[model samples]
Target: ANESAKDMTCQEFIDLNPKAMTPVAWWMLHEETVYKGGDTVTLNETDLTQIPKVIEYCKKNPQKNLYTFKNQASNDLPN
Candidate 1:
């Protein structure tokens, strides 16, 4: 079973969190490889475009687990 987060739905996680999502956070949760690695992706304004896609996918999947990692994504943060 997933070992991190609130064990909440994906939309729940994104909605309840206070901080605006960071690039690394979204990238780590990505559903499919959006062409990871090879240095900075935002070598263009378009690279900024990926954020919304990540958010949408996160909403769709809704898990404490992440694909890139072999197991859970993080130790559950304090509430």
Candidate 2:
């Protein structure tokens, strides 16, 4: 996503806000599947003045749990 930031490159954004980016990267790695499935990821809001409203949403809610596996072996797969 940062790759598409015209005003700032991915590296520039990372350089400017290392703290914010660090957590974001970690969350992305941990939840790789979610991101791969087109889910939106977010990080903590450190600098609100520079970032936009949508990005702010990402900042406010990071690593939100979207799924879970339960003990239903019978329904786990089709026979």
Candidate 3:
């Protein structure tokens, strides 16, 4: 089953199967960025190194249960 990542907690995400993490990470990031109708501009190019950083963030901040990019990408969209 694919993860909507809508209600997935940081710890819950960390427990996902090995293969699930790759796509999950990409999907999660995609939701944060404003993608084009048929675009691939999301951060799917560097999963190898990017995933660990994600995991590291997840581990350190489990309190932020809902795994959205709100904390990190708070300044993503400009006013």
Choose the strongest candidate by lDDT. 3
The digit string of per-residue lDDT tens for model 2 on 1-79 reads 5442323333344344656754443332233333344322333232232234323334454332211111111122212
Question: Over the stretch 13-36, how does candidate 3's per-residue lDDT look in tens digits?
Answer: 778786977777655554555634
Alpha-carbon lDDT, every model: 0.44, 0.33, 0.59
Distance (Å) between predicted and true CA of 56, model 3? Answer: 1.0
Using Cα atoms with residue i matched to residue i, what is each candidate's TM-score against the true structure? 0.37, 0.23, 0.59
Of candidate 3, the 10-residue stretch with the lowest lDDT total is 70-79
Model 3 steric clash total: 0
**How far out, in Å, is residue 75 in model 1?**
26
As for TM-score, the candidate ahead, 2 or 3, is 3
Candidate 3 global TM-score: 0.59
Q: What ordering of candidates by lDDT runs from best to worst?
A: 3, 1, 2
Of models 2 and 3, which has the larger lDDT?
3
Instruction: Give candidate 3 regions above 4 Å deviation.
Output: 1-4, 32-34, 37-49, 70-79
Q: Write the per-residue lDDT of candidate 1 for residues 1-79, one digit (tens) a residue.
A: 5554424355555775446455444444332334444444332333345445545666777773333331343311211
Model 1, C-alpha of 70: deviation from truth (Å): 13
Where's the lowest-lDDT run of ten residues in candidate 2? 65-74
